[model samples]
Target chain A: HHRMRWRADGRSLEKLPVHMGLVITEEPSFSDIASLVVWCMAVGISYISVYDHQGIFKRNNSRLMDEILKQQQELAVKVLSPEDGKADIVRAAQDFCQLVAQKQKRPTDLDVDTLASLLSSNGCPDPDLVLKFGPVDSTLGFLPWHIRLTEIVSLPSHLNISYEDFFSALRQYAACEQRLGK
Target chain B: GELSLWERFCANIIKAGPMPKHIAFIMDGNRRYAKKCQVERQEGHSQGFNKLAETLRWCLNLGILEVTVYAFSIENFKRSKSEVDGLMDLARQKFSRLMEEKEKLQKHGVCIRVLGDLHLLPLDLQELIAQAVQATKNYNKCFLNVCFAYTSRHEISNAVREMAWGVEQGLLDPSDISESLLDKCLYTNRSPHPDILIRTSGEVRLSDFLLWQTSHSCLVFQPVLWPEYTFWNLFEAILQFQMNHSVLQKARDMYAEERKRQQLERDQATVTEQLLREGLQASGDAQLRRTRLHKLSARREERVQGFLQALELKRADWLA
Candidate 1:
């Protein structure tokens, strides 16, 4: 009996993104979005962020949250708004300027890692994978610095959700490799 | 390519609407392509190059104005010393030996831009890359962006540090450092962000290429290897992007509106300046920094404006 047989491949991954960003393009199906949050939590993804360009989901966080709990009340996963990414970057810039102003660090001493640590201090780790649904392409301002080494892919619609489709997206993310500036 | 009949047929239909002005590519599955061909890995990368050239033709034929391709990664250097030299040898043969090689492509009036932290390169290759860029800088009928030794992180890092230096040099204020400055500092400054990005070879990862630019680009992941990537594959990506064209456009407009609103609010320098001045007030030393920042900001604005002018001149310079 192959029960969630594909789940095996997902679990076998040496690594998976710690946080998953689910950015949709239109008024969301709270039911489907909740399913996706569950799908993500079912695997290795520890956090999820839901965004719609017009702030529908941001406003509907309680309704969306309710739907998720309706599915699994005990299951808990933390999430944040994409706006958090900016606040984090701005705060990091502040810290960066403060340090440079104090002469504690050379201006050139700043690198991606240095900034990542600075920005990540307050926010979650930059999204490892941002699944963009609704065929709308273009990062709708996900994160300025986080796009580095991030994998962004598209899903047609979140209306009628499918676990296989979600898994395939995850499977694809897992299958890819990055040469860290070898 | 002598217009294949189907190419002509579909070209007209696709010209109807939903065309991408620029297309981004991730060349993947080449080594795997070699495996499938039972050929050496050497042939894989080479064939991928050929496919890239062929893809360019598709763009030109289909009326795409811009094409950006991932050529070499900053990390590809770690593969092996042999790879480093192997690529160098081939690159030289095509680019250096074929300085005439560029002359061949001039027939199409294609613009070439190589994006990279190009300084650390061996002098021979560095000079050669410089020639290619300077030589064809003007050809914009069809534009090409070569991501040579590029990673979005490195590009952003370069842009970010440039701002740090600007602050360090007392040429620009940290308050002036933001996304737009970073955007202007990077290699994609002149070209519009890609409308659609296609990655061949079934790889889901962007591999740190154009991380900043492709934020909203329609990403198309295909199962075909690079060498075997067909005209159909190219059309497939185009067709897929067209399906979402309306949504894509709306998303783009909203993003622009969001950015516009934020910048407009901050244009007055309210929140940040208020806090900064509240701490020290924009008096005395604060006033001094403020004056310097304005002066420096003006100077750099002119500097970037001039930089754009020079690049346009080169674009005009190349074909002449």
Candidate 2:
């Protein structure tokens, strides 16, 4: 019955080289992380990135990494390091100062894209879908640059989440037809 | 074409919807997640990070390119010093590690940026942050934006200050101040505003995140802890976003049109006022001349010179 429901709902629409991001409102257990990684492998995801308020997963998850590598020898996963863009802006500021020093150009003289390019550019594709597992209406502090058109899904809680539930979400994503916010 | 069952399924799903270009997140409820898991606060934070790592893969498989996460807030500095210190250490460790992952980030064309007040952070961490950003400065295929020590008010004020300085230096005229100008001064000026804003822990407040940007965003509040967030939660939010998508877009268009109309009205009013003022001035001069002529009219019959002047005035009026 569960499998039938999953297929009926659109779980069959899962794609590859998935770059997914998770926004956890609470503290996650090791098991939660493990389950998630396993799910990624099952779903054929290539790269995964995680973030918390305290930067715990980035600094303290070496054990989980080793375990995942040992268990999923055939699957290649690259864990991304979470970063803030403050330094990039600072560097851009420095660049702008130098530009002014050398060229004595006015702020109006520079075009919008030139200034933007100086800030930083991302090479990774944006998240097609974002999962929010908590009870909030705001994006606590997500990246302001990348989410212009991405779809966001919210779940009630992450604790004890079922594969069925996860699949249903994928189904939902597959079924979604964005109108460009129209 | 030959295909595996899963591959066939994926092909069908891809047809159902156009993929999202970028996705932003607000990770809330670390404290609550910690309480529920019976772990230390620090552990809860760790779990949140782990969740993000797993989810990133899901997005990549789905063909989503860019992802941004809210990792820290400038207001979070108000928390206890121990907690703040711990978070700083965590930042330092991860950022330094990111330096080591430069090749990995570059291989994927993943550009990393820190969006916030860097000077407020510890000097060492700031240096590491710079290194990471510098390392991946040239990539454009994928983007990761982390907000640490970030607040909407802080970002806006920074832009305002820069604009003010520009005007002072005569590099930018005050008249040149516009929406795009202000946007350029913002931290995320280089990035697009989020399409959907999902907050964890069932909280509905913005908590000072992206204040000026989310005018048309689809906001979702889930009744779950942040740590417990999973694919299910995300799916639900996207579905909700889809439902309201059309209405939100209409509203956005209406607002833009409204602003445009207002600007036009202001311009029209200025033109009308100038015309009215000019007409009044001309009318005032004509009225003064009439009064002078009337005064001379009474003496016209008694004095020949006055009569002569009135005759001349009448002749002038009759002439082309």
Candidate 3:
């Protein structure tokens, strides 16, 4: 039934993504965070990752997870720490240092995958949609390596967002067509 | 449960747009948002963090796979001790939670990646971060990158230092250096560059975030403070991206085409050199071979001229 209108018009609508990333510029109350997670489950998304300037979410992961589980089940949540990222870089750099010692001649002498192996060799897909809850126009150094093709949506603030407003963002994302630079 | 007609319609519309692969946030304006709310600075920061959790759910529902955020900057460390300590306390709390949630995150296939200078953080926080990272090392379905104590300049400088060390060790030749090579050495070489950059608080500057990678990204600057950001502002930004995507894409295509042409010319030159060397090595009437080679050279020059002329006209048209 939901496909009827688009099919009739010979138009195709994009489906909801399986994973999503969210960034907030402010600290949210526990209720807001819980509601947000519940909303994601309601929308049929399989995965959700959150980030903030203060690392508050990572610190409060257990409480938030418990709270979220009380409302919804079978959802996964994790707090990423900065040390993990550095560890990968240290590993990759050491390998690259060895490669340099080997005197590789090509401009692309180093294998990107080999270096990336330090991070996630198991294929972590990039974010399909990035939502920034703030007024700034820059990414402020968000995922410098994994956001090459992601679409970013910026909201004024996350203080009092409604379901309608969020749906509109999703709708806007749905209307986009990625050209991949031809 | 039965769905409302309006909700159904909205859902359909949401499904019509192309989903992003990865999204990053600058998360500006916490102080300003605090001021607007007549709250303490700490309260504002806390609010910003809470907002982040809500936004994450929104992204998940939308099906984004990876998320990265600039949580703390090296420059930020220069702030007052109390404030910095406050942030460190926040970090301690979050990292401990992360360590505890490792199993749950792994169960859901969520990989957590933290990138930054870890040594600068408190010793205990670093250990917690390390433990959390180790716990979730195997998950791959989704990724979360947190940039703490990070700066693009520092990252770039670190890459350069690595490359220089390689050169000193006689591993890499200076002439072999290229942009991609540098990218491989950078802290983010493991990840893809962001496609879109959203800065809050109406700030229009890059502030040294991903300075090298955001070559063709769409920038969205909302006037709202970080704490005040809501889904409405997010919709407007995405709307803007949809409207202007073509222009951004076209520019990227043109740049790629230019690079392709240059590479083609270089390959042609290499082929010509190889041909000349091979011809010289063959046994033949040297004078006659020279004449033949001259004719070939003349033809090749003519072809090159033709190509150059066409390219000139194209450039002229593009400029006009």
The two-chain DockQ for each candidate, comma-separated, is: 0.45, 0.03, 0.04
User: What are the chain B TM-scores of all models?
Assistant: 0.84, 0.78, 0.78
In candidate 1 the C-alpha lDDT for residue B160 amounts to 66
For candidate 2 chain A, which ten residues in a row score worst on lDDT?
A: A80-89
lDDT of 1 at B119: 65
Q: What TM-score would each prediction reach against the true structure?
A: 0.82, 0.53, 0.54
Candidate 3 residue B248 C-alpha distance from true site, Å: 2.1
Residues B1-320, candidate 1, lDDT per residue (tens digit)?
Answer: 64588978887898897799999998887888898889888888788788887888888889887988888887888878876787777776667754676666577687778888776567788778778878886676788888887778777766666556556655555666566666766778888888898888656667777877876678788889888988889988998889878877877787677766776565536534754866755457556545644665576577555544543444342322
Instruction: Show where candidate 1 strays beyond 4 Å.
Output: A1-17, A42-44, A66-71, A74-98, A101-103, A121-123, A137-139, A147-155, A160-182, B102-108, B268-320
Q: Per-residue CA lDDT of candidate 3, range A41-99, in tens?
A: 56665666676544577788787777787755422443443222332344445455545
- CA lDDT, every prediction? 0.73, 0.60, 0.60
Q: Is the docking of candidate 1 incorrect, acceptable, medium or high quality?
A: acceptable
Candidate number with greatest lDDT:
1
lDDT of 2 by residue, B180-279 (tens): 4566677786677676767777554456667557745678777678778766576666666666666555555654665456545544454445546665
Query: Could you give candidate 1's per-residue lDDT for residues A5-114 as a string of tens digits?
Result: 53464577766878788878655688888888877776657778776667777777788788998976534344445455544565566567656766787778888677
Best-to-worst ranking by lDDT: 1, 3, 2
> How high is the lDDT of residue A175 in model 3?
69
Off by over 4 Å in 2: A1-182, B1-15, B267-320
After superposition, the stretches of candidate 3 with alpha carbons farther than 4 Å from their true spots are: A1-182, B1-14, B264-320
Model 2 per-residue lDDT tens digits across residues A1-182: 34344234333574432565565545666556556666655665545555443345666678667766664443333333223232233335445544444546454444434544554444455456556665444333344334433456667777888777766666666655543211
Interface RMSD of 3: 13.7
The backbone clash count of each candidate, in order, is: 11, 76, 58
